[PDB]
User: Fold this.
Amino acid sequence: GRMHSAGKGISSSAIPYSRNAPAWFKLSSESVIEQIVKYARKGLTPSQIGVLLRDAHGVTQARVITGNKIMRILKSNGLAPEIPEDLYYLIKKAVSVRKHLERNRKDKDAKFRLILIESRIHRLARYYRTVAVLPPNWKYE
Amino acid sequence: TREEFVSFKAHYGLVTGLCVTQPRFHDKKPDLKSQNFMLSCSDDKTVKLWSINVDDYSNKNNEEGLIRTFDGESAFQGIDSHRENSTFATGGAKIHLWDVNRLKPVSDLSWGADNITSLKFNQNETDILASTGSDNSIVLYDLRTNSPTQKIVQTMRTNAICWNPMEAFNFVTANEDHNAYYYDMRNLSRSLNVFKDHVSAVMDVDFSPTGDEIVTGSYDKSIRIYKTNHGHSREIY
Amino acid sequence: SAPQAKILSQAPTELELQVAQAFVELENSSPELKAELRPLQFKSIREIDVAGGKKALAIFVPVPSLAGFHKVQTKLTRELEKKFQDRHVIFLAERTLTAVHDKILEDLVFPTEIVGKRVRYLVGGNKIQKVLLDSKDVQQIDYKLESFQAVYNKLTGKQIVFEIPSETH
Amino acid sequence: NLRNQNKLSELLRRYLLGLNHNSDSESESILKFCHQLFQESEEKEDFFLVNLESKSYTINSNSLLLNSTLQKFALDLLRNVITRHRSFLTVSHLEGFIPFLRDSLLSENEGVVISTLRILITLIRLDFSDESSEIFKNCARKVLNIIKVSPSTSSELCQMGLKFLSAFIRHTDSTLKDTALSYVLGRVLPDLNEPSRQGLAFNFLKALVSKHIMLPELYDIADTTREIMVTNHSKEIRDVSRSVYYQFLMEYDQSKGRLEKQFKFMVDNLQYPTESGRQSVMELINLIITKANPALLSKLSSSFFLALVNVSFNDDAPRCREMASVLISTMLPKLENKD
Amino acid sequence: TRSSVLADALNAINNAEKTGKRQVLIRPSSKVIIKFLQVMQKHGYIGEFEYIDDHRSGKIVVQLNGRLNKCGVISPRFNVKIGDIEKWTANLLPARQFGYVILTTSAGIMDHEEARRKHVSGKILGFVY
Amino acid sequence: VQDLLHPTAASEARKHKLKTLVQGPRSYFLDVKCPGCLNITTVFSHAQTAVTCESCSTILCTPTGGKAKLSEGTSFRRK
Amino acid sequence: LSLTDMMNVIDDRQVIENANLLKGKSSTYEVPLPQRIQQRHDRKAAYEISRQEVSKWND
Amino acid sequence: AKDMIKH
Amino acid sequence: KLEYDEKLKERFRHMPEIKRISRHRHVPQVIKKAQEIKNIELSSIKRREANERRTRKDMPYISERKKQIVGTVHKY
Ligand SMILES: [Zn+2]
Assistant:
């Protein structure tokens, strides 16, 4: 099922059937909201905030506990990324391999992986430009 | 003779049950010597009682055809007739008790909202009834009490039930796990015996009137015969 | 506090007045639960029958205060069924129709939760709708499943069958 | 199909309601009409021909359904006219319908029979000839046969028979054998455990106590119903149950040890957990206070009084506290000086 | 190239029937699949079917009684006139009276005979026999 | 043979998380009591970060491939 | 104040026996159970009887 | 019991 | 003669040669291949359960008769 690869893996998360907060959770929703903003102010990506909020504080999911996703919680409090996190990391991976490719001009294997990453940026870049999350004039490098 | 006494286009839908009965109308004694009655139920939500002419005796010398019709609110799926008297029970979305002389169901039996797929009266203790559910369940009823008695849930569905003619308190179940299970009515926790030869779902089971053999029909295109004391078929047809 | 303060409705019913009196009595007896109970206030009460002949008290509540009730709901249910025995007391918020309906279901099943939902299609065309509940409080809910069916039918006009897997009933 | 039959039943019911207000219903032509409805209800060639049909026609029969439907309407209309206009409820006008009533009683469908029972209950007071009176005796026999086949008394037809059976005993001179009543009471006892749908049977139970017929089961009735008073939730059941049990007590003979146990129950039942159950006892206690022998009151003054003040002192329900205080108020003036 | 959910469900039912399986699990579900299975159930080509709610599309499980020869979805969903129905039947089916063409018409999804009975027509959805 | 509608409870526990009749999570949440201060913290069973006591800054668990290894001396309960 | 405390304050022993209905085991009826529970007990009581009846066939 | 009520 | 043979066969049923002929039936090919596959599954399931009991402290023993039952309402 992987694109750009032949792998058929099915590793993923299994959201529980119940969409209500766990009974054992006993922390105010507002107190949670103050916590996401603090981490984002510190520079953590929304994915990172969820991991910490899940690992050490008992926030099973942002939406179930607070009724709202981390993205809109941050956007309400003035915190939001320039570009979507998905596109953000893909750009760096394209940046990093280019830097290595600059130093090593014979690494033909890296040259290929750039094409796959580069093709993947376009497809994701197309989508966000379609939904107007990204300005139409935006272009990659 | 391998010929038909009569042929009827009884129902618009599928015939989902059939039983042969000797009705006892309150004011009329049917000439069972010259007539035999059969009762059919279908998913058209009707139960039609029929009369057929027969040549068993020649002490006479008609009225052959539909005799009475019972209307139902829901689709029917299983029917069987109390032996001692006329009353019969029909199993659809709810298992109902009917009387030949009452168009509406005389009384309602039901454990719960789960429907009943098949049923079978007892042959010796005539007041006891067994039924099968779509929730992989077997229920037991007692007309003298007019209530369900026991419920057991199995790993897979059971399609038919038959009572042992010689032992009033035993019955075998055709099941959908390639098996037939021989049960004791008084203690359903443990099955008396298990028959294992089949390779597809078992669809029906019957007891020899001698009580010493059971046959099981399967979806595997075969017929198997078992002894009541052994756990494997002695024959395949 | 007066019972009328508990009652949001301008013209309180006799049953509303009696249940509000029970509220304020638990408030007075409560040494620190009072702090939570005072902000809690209910919109109304309805009294609806069940097949077994018992009765259910459906308390209609505002959603943000429905949350606060849920935080304290179990104890209130217990002392209320003490003050009003022969009653299954239940707190339901007043509020797409599928959304509001399953929210009403979630309110009813509380404190327990719905393990799942099934709908069976028989051959004749009928449909059997069934809701699977967990076994946390299996005894208490088993004492009230008929009441839940009756309440959900009365409010939402649907026939449902409450079932608790992992137990044979 | 059955659903459309229900729809047709609803439409037929409405027509009857309109017939009630219709001025024609006051006319005598309607009986002639109802009588009209009553009597209205009761190969080598083929080897050459070309046949191109593939579907067989299903055997079916609805003519019976027509006759039952028309009979149900006619009986339903006939009862409405006689109830509303008394003069048509006379022996002369309804002689022609008696033979039809007997046919309908044997009619298969119970809905039409239920109507036949309803109209018959109207006519039990009405005088009749020799041949028109046997119907009442015969119908009494049939309803027992109805109770026979019925697995449970809690069926629409079953209750209506008891209603007729009660009215049969109450009015008609002839009375059934005690053994039959004993079995009927026997069948009523288990089904009575679900009083919600047993409303008619209580009137039949009220009928026997009204005539004070002696049966063994009737004592078992008294104990079960007394429980129903303080346990069943429907007010209507509590009201009727209160009458029969109270009626059973003040008439039927009982041993002195038995008397204390019932009065022992009621004082205990004043502490029943449910407020209505406590309330339902109060009317019974009050009935004793309102009407009872002074000697009976004197034996019970101390017992009742303090059970009353006790609830009046502590009660989760103010109304029961108010009622208990009231019953004391109507108690003390009647009490003897020593009491 | 992926297939429509209705097509996948029908292929699953066909394979389960021909392999001798007595019950088949269909995922994902849809209103269209439920109406299709309702029609088939009315004409007896399957038994009961049960719908499991997973907070996703959802799942179905269909008991099979073996009376199903074949089912299929027909595309492109070309329109058919009422008087035209007969012709189409004679082409899409084995014989004159065997099988039922299923049509999406203004009154819902239904077999072709009920469409004749109500004098309604529309596009064709698929065929069962 | 299995009834896909009504599978036995043991049989589901054997299947993959996403292959159950209704998919669900197999992880769970714990209370781990800090050795240093005796305070309790909620720690996800499969935590990907070295959870630390907020009051002690003491390591409670360490990330692994699967289940998080709880640091030695750290008493725990399932929540 | 339970009912017993009141009949104790009398301290007469002749009024107490006049209060005969008040001494003995409590006879207040217990609250009925929910319907589905009640029928389940009926079903069990029904199952036992059926077992006793068919046991006659055991010999 | 069926016999008694019969008479 | 026929009754004599019936008793005679019952007596020597446990024999090898009499078994080989008496239990021999010609089943369709599809029913067979189910049996060989169904046998290989059954043997392995035993072998895995046998390997379990070597290292598992608490594995109860469940009779085949009590396997199909999930539960009963009225316990005794
Ligand atoms: Zn610490």
